[PDB]
Structure formats: structure tokens, C-alpha cells
Amino acid sequence: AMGSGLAKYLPGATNLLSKSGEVSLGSLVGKTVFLYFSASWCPPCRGFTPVLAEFYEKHHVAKNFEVVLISWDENESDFHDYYGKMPWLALPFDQRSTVSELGKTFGVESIPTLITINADTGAIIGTQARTRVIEDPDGANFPW
């Protein structure tokens, strides 16, 4: 809720989408969270998403992290179809006005981009995970 370190970034947001029910921001307590800025029509994103999905499947429990899609999709059908390819969570389509604001907050200058955040404190703990996933698809230097 308001306690979450993520709350400062997602002011008008309560829940995130998951593969089952919606989950509270408080459910991410204690986790490392990767904010994944992406879009369904972006070719580098389309190429990276399955790589990240493999990374998530292998490591998300062992290394206690979550991924949250922050989608640049303007079309709701595209948003749901593309998030449907992903195992992790998503900022709901109804919050999409905040996407450009979030990008500006973290200095996102292109996508795909991962921003690594401490969920509890909201501290930025990395901005280059999109690159580190390529070089180190196994666990070695967590959370970079």
C-alpha cells in the first residue's frame, strides 16, 4: 500500500495484474523488482521478452525477484495479447497515462529497458539489467 517503496512511483495505482488474480503492491514486500519498459510492436522488445522470460523462469524464486511490465502499448488488445506471452506482473492498462511519467522519472531514453528497484525502499539499484541479462543469463552478479 502507501508503505511500499514502489508507491512513490505509482501514485494512482493499487494493484498489478498477475497470471491469476490482481495483486497488491504490498505483495512485493522484500523483493527486488525489475520494471520492464516494453511494447508489443517494438522489435528489440519482441526479441528480448522471451530471453527475459527464460531468465525469470530460472531465477525469480531463487533470487527473489519480480518483473513488472510497464507497457508503451496504446491499444488494449495489443497490451493483453503481449502481456499474455509473459509470466510476470503488469501495471494495468488503465494506468497507462503514468508510463511516460515513469520513463521520465528513471531517465528511460529507449526500450526495452529494465530498471531494478528495491521494493521496500524504492531505491534504484540498477539501470542496465537488460544488458546484464544478455552477458550473465545464469546467476552470478545479482542484482548487478
Ligand X SMILES: Cc1nc2scc(-c3ccc(F)cc3)c2c(=O)[nH]1
Number of Cβ atoms within 10 Å of the Cβ of 22: 13
CB-based contacts of 1, cutoff 8 Å, min separation 6: 7, 24, 25, 26
Q: Report the site for ligand X in 77-106 (rule: CB under 6 A).
A: 103
Query: In terms of CB distance, is 57 or 101 closer to ligand X?
Result: 101
**What is the size of the binding site for ligand X (CB under 6 A)?**
8
Q: Is 67 in the site for ligand X (CB under 6 A)?
A: no
Closest approach of Cβ 77 to ligand X, in Å? 17
Number of Cβ atoms within 10 Å of the Cβ of 92: 17
d(CA 117, CA 31): 9
CA-wise closest residue to 15 among 84, 95, 72: 95
Query: In terms of CB distance, is 37 or 65 closer to ligand X?
Result: 37
Which residues is 90 bridged to in the sheet?
Answer: 17, 69
Mask of contacts with ligand X, 37-56, x by CB under 6 A? --x--x--------------
Closest approach of Cβ 72 to ligand X, in Å? 4
Give exposure, 111-136, as e/b (b: 16+ Cβ within 10 Å): bbbbbbbbbeeeeeebeebbebbeee
Q: Is 129 in the site for ligand X (CB under 6 A)?
A: no
Query: In terms of CB distance, is 105 or 118 closer to ligand X?
Result: 105
Choose, by CB under 6 A, the member of 9, 48, 56, 72 that binds ligand X.
72
Binding site for ligand X (CB under 6 A): 39, 42, 72, 103, 108-111
